[PDB]
């Protein structure tokens, strides 16, 4: 019988939640495992396996301590790293990539400014706070 003890320390769980968790859990694993029961199984050189936005080539250069078609390759490549290998890009219409691209760096550049005083005046900030 399906085990539900760890999902709630209360030894009894009403049957609605039993299938609610069971059907929830299986597809959650099915998403991770496929791009069955939980209790039967949980399983399944540079050490670093993955970094968000890092491809296999970028991992290799780390181990070494380091026109329309071409820009479309850069168009998709830019969104590959930022969207963490999202599969919806290939379904996007080509002219819909352009406006999302321009908003990417424009939003990105704003981060650079954010990420980057006379004696009498700058003493007040500590007094008032």
């Amino acid at each position: 019988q399906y085990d539900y003890s760890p999902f709630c320390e209360r030894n009894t769980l009403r049957e609605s939640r039993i299938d609610s968790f069971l059907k929830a859990e299986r597809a959650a694993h099915c998403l991770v495992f496929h791009k069955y029961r939980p209790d039967i199984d949980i399983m399944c050189s540079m050490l670093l396996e993955s970094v968000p936005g890092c491809n296999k080539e970028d991992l290799e250069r780390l181990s070494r301590r380091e026109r329309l078609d071409d820009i479309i390759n850069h168009e998709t490549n830019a969104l590959k790293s930022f969207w963490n290998d999202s599969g919806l890009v290939n379904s996007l219409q080509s002219h819909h990539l352009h406006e999302e691209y321009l908003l990417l760096q424009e939003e990105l550049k704003n981060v650079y400014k954010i990420k980057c005083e006379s004696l009498r005046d700058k003493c007040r900030r500590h007094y008032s706070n």
């Binding site: 004696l119 700058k122 003493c123 500590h126 007094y127």
Partner: protein
């Protein structure tokens, strides 16, 4: 001072920052104003971003009326430590040196509320309150200053 002259090697004397602090404070206590400044300047040369006790330097430099050195020291001290009461007391000493003193009183009381156990801030408050031509506030502040340090 005689022990410094005799029992202290010169190389240790002129390189030790703590010895510089001690000799400067000592020569202040003998009211030797010229002697202390040229060693406190060496102290600042060795390290500018040190707070420890610039209360003595602020008291001296108010007497010497060197506004620019006080401005530079207050800037550096507060930019390093904002919460150290010594920085705020130096700032208030500078403000009293300038002219206005009510904001100096406010700065001093803020310095005290950083550390309630800093007697010299209290006594600087009390001495300043004489410049206000007010005695009752000055008297209470003097008593509260002497409370913190029994031997002052």
């Amino acid at each position: 001072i005689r022990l410094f002259e005799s029992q202290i090697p010169s190389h240790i004397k002129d390189t030790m920052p703590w010895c510089l602090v001690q000799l400067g404070k000592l020569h202040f206590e003998i009211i030797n104003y010229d002697m202390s400044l040229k060693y406190f300047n060496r102290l600042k040369d060795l390290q500018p971003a040190r707070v420890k006790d610039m209360e003595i330097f602020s008291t001296l430099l108010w007497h010497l009326h060197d506004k620019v050195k006080s401005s530079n020291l207050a800037n550096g001290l507060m930019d390093t430590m904002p919460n150290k009461p010594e920085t705020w007391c130096c700032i208030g000493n500078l403000l009293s040196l300038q002219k206005d003193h009510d904001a100096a009183i406010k700065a001093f009381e803020k310095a005290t509320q950083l550390d309630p156990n800093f007697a010299y801030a209290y006594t600087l408050q009390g001495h300043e309150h004489s410049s206000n031509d007010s005695s009752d506030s000055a008297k209470t502040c003097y008593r509260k200053a002497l409370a913190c340090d029994p031997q002052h």
